Amino acid sequence: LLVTKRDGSTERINLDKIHRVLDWAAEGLHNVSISQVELRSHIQFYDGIKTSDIHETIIKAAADLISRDAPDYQYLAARLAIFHLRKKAYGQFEPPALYDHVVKMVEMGKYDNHLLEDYTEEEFKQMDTFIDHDRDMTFSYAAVKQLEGKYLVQNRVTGEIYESAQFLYILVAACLFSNYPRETRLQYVKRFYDAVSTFKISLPTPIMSGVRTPTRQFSSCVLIECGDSLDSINATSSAIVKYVSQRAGIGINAGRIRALGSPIRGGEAFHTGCIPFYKHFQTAVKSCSQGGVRGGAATLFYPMWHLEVESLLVLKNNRGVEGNRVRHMDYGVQINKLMYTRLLKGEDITLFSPSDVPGLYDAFFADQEEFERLYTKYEKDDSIRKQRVKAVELFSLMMQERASTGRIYIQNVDHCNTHSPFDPAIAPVRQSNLCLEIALPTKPLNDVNDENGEIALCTLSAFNLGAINNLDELEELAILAVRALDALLDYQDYPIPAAKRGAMGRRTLGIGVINFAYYLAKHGKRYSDGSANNLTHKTFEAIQYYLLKASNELAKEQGACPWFNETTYAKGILPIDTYKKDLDTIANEPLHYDWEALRESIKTHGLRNSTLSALMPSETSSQISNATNGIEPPRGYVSIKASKDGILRQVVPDYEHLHDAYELLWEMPGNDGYLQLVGIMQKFIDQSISANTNYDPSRFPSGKVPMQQLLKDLLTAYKFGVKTLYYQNTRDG
């Protein structure tokens, strides 16, 4: 009895229509009740209830029954959501013709005009044939929520949704392979479209929301290195403002900024310290955030031996004078072998301003022998300003602050340069990014547009280990993933010269996995007992092998990156030659691929991209593919998310059959198992991994995690070559 439509015209309620829809969306699901849904939604209907409202109501109805015991409600809700969005975008369930859609969207200025110039209407007709709009039915409610909220092209003021997932994927393919010769262009478009619509390959939010639209901004994270100079400080700051203004994560290395008290100009003026500048980079970072809060993230890096280290380590400590705190940025403490030995031998660590110890800073990242030489030399030399601190004290201080805030990260710089794709002497890795997985060369700017500066970027993607059947599927998947991002590099715009410089110079990519947890469950391994070591070794060898192959194949086609000669890859060196040897004692799986054939092929034809893999975290992308995030174990079987539209629940993949197979985050007795697996993955990974360390207070006497335990785990990670360490989760129930 009485319903209102979209024009605002009444009509009587035919309740079999609704039922039909529910009936349709339930097709194939197990354990869902259409009556349950009907019952819960019919009670909230009323005379003249907008038709849209009816849709929302049954969607929520379905959405509110999501559960571990009835996980198909996810798909029932999803489909209803998909149906509604169809009507919302097209005024009907059936999506328009690809060509008709693109024309319309070009005329409305929602899509890039180049699409119509780059492809012919018959080409668009051809692409349409690749599309499979029923794939929309494979998304899980949470996923549809993500697509609707941050992927699908829409009007943010009015609310209007202008497209559908399949169109998004086809046009992302179309745009990324638009410069291909016509003999293979559409073959690639089709292959990549299938790869992404069947969730084999995940692509970052910026790419997914924008590639197809008129924008050209797609970089999610930047790495700026700051020289010790007002000009460089100013330059750095300017770069950050431009980059956070395009919503990018910032990773800043401010390690050479000389210490407080250091001479300036001679003896005419003494330095003011690093903090004042850190505060300045922090305002730069939050310059485009509501008030000075909402968004804009950064992670600043400094050597453990910096003279102001003890003041830098407590910058997030809340209990402290305002002037001696830079609380809204995460920090990455950089350690090397020598520092750890100081700890183990119960010795001292000497603190030094980088400005007063010629060659130390470079040595630290590029040459450990030379670092050690210089370090001891300057320890003796009494002319050099310095400070002694007890290694245990320093380490404990750092771990304390890491334990309390969770955000004091570690970067093992020796591991970052002895086991990397680059030549430490020519292009060392002296920092990471926001989430501690990127590891690339950087050069300080002396001005925003300085052409001799170098800024690293994150050009990412990921394989879904839950969606491949065998590891040999990664050969085609790696082809597509490498070929699309490489295209992206030429596709997008660079706001700062230095950022283009490194992009074109080295063409560095960072491809990782999502769904690791589910994959291990599928093979009956766990994280904590070492049961997954060899499988992990097997799996990451495939990933790296096929990515290097794809890049090598691409170099043949289009030429290696300009700066390929600064890579160790160029010198015939491979990941399997410089990994951390201790790894041998925790896994015996033998290399299955022909690395030596490849070694030569790389030597001969080079690599298109200087770096190819990087294991980054992933909330969104994982959500769309209903996959456990990146390489982390799930906290629980059902994940809750808040929204204006209600509570969002997502059940881990195949909970039905794998509930006992999973090993949930807090079921692991400690971090060893996991730190082993990260070490194994690092053997083959070009860049770094976002490793986490987790602690449950319940597992310790008096509920207090022992510092001994914290240092033990830190040393473990170093022992197996872990490059960086990100979050520390302390459970708290």
Partner: peptide, 13 residues
């Protein structure tokens, strides 16, 4: 916060 250096000393980096 209690840290034993002897326990850690024998560790092999």
């Amino acid at each position: 916060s209690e840290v034993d250096t002897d326990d850690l000393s024998n560790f092999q980096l």
